[PDB]
Amino acid sequence: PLPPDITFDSLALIKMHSQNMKRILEVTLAKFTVNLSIVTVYRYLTARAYLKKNIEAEFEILKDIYNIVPLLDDIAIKAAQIEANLIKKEITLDMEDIITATTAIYTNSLLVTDDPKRYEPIRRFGLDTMPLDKFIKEVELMVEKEL
Amino acid sequence: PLPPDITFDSLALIKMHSQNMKRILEVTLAKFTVNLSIVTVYRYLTARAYLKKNIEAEFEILKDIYNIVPLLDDIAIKAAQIEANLIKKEITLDMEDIITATTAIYTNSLLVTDDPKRYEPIRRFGLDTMPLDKFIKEVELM
């Protein structure tokens, strides 16, 4: 089964909100505690701003649904520690990946993403990931089993 | 005519802390209000880990010296609008740059950097920049 605390990166959050995922989204929000990094929220909004959506309004909706986690001092410190040792090993990941993974570790959330291997170098620091497609199938199974 | 509020991107801030800048830094903190994005300080701490391994202690030191601005919701929102506008023009600045510039606008701070051209496409949104070299010269004098 799946753990209670989970999170998504911007790409995954975009899909979770697509019209084809309406049902899966409803179940996920009803059964899980989703902790999103403000960074993930900002990047999601960039995609929404691209198609001229009302950002201010969509932000309130997200805030009214999710536990939006700020870039806390502890996250800033932890992220700097992870990035520095990774960099010391010629491993370079973009800022979004670092903050997203650091926040997942901090909130003890399973990071659902369509590209888990990209985050693989952060596992050693405590990060746990799961393929989005497997996550979706898991939730569907949950629905099938219900009374 | 330097303004009261200023900021730096991580690269510029790293130089401001060079041993050979102690004087310039002392005057700066003495005459200006420096508002740094939380993103800028994490990159700064990351880049100096080879010199100061105690990230936690280093963060506390910074928190006491500067005004550290969080990635507030309004900054998140505005950063999204700006990035979408740049992407439409096929301009791809990295996250740090977008948030640094967005925070500067939010705090009404002059962004001191070594690469102002990079940020130029954002001036239409209220951003104000100045070359680190000029800033250093402008500061050399009471």
CATH number of the domain encompassing residue B8: 3.40.50.1010
Residue B26: other Cβ atoms inside 10 A? 10
Write the burial class of residue A4 (CB in 10 Å: 0-12 exposed, 13-18 middle, 19+ buried).
Answer: exposed
Domain count, chain B: 1
Measured distance CA(A48)–CA(A115) in Å, rounded: 21
Could you tell me which chain A residue has the CA closest to the CA of B68? Answer: A73
Measured distance CA(B128)–CA(B119) in Å, rounded: 9
Measured distance CA(B51)–CA(A128) in Å, rounded: 31
Q: Do B46 and A77 make contact, defined as CB atoms within 8 angstroms? A: no
Residue with tokens 């420096």: B34
Q: Which two tokens stand for residue B90?
A: 């096929």
Given in angstroms, what resolution was this structure solved at? Answer: 2.0
Q: Do B38 and A76 make contact, defined as CB atoms within 8 angstroms? A: yes
Residues of B in contact with A85 (CB under 8 A): 49
H or E stretch covering B8: strand B5-8
Nearest to A103 by CA among A58, A67, A62: A67
Measured distance CA(B127)–CA(B119) in Å, rounded: 8
> What is the largest distance, in Å, between two alpha-carbon atoms of chain B?
44
Parallel, antiparallel or unpaired: strands B5-8 and A129-131: unpaired
Residue with tokens 């570790």: A105
Domain span at residue A147 reads 1-147
Cβ neighbours for B54, distance < 8 A, ≥ 6 positions apart: none
The 3-class SS string of B14-78 reads: HHHCCHHHHHHHHHHHHHCEEEEEHHHHHHHHHHCCCCCCCHHHHHHHHHHHCEEECCCHHHHHH
Could you tell me which chain A residue has the CA closest to the CA of B82? Answer: A46
Nearest to A118 by CA among A12, A21, A3: A12
Measured distance CA(B22)–CA(B26) in Å, rounded: 6
Q: Do A50 and B96 make contact, defined as CB atoms within 8 angstroms? A: no
Measured distance CA(A22)–CA(A143) in Å, rounded: 14
Q: Output the CA angle A13-A60-A109, nearest 5 degrees.
A: 40
Residue with tokens 């659902």: A112
Residues of A in contact with B95 (CB under 8 A): 39, 43, 94-96
State which approach was used to obtain the coordinates. X-ray
Nearest to B71 by CA among B114, B115, B41: B41
Cβ neighbours for B39, distance < 8 A, ≥ 6 positions apart: A71, A95, B71, B95, B96, B99, B100, B103
Measured distance CA(B142)–CA(B138) in Å, rounded: 9
Measured distance CA(A38)–CA(A56) in Å, rounded: 14
Q: Do A73 and B63 make contact, defined as CB atoms within 8 angstroms? A: yes
Integer angstrom CA distances of residue A18 from A15, A23, B62, B76: 5, 10, 42, 21
Nearest to B99 by CA among A74, A75, A52, A38: A38
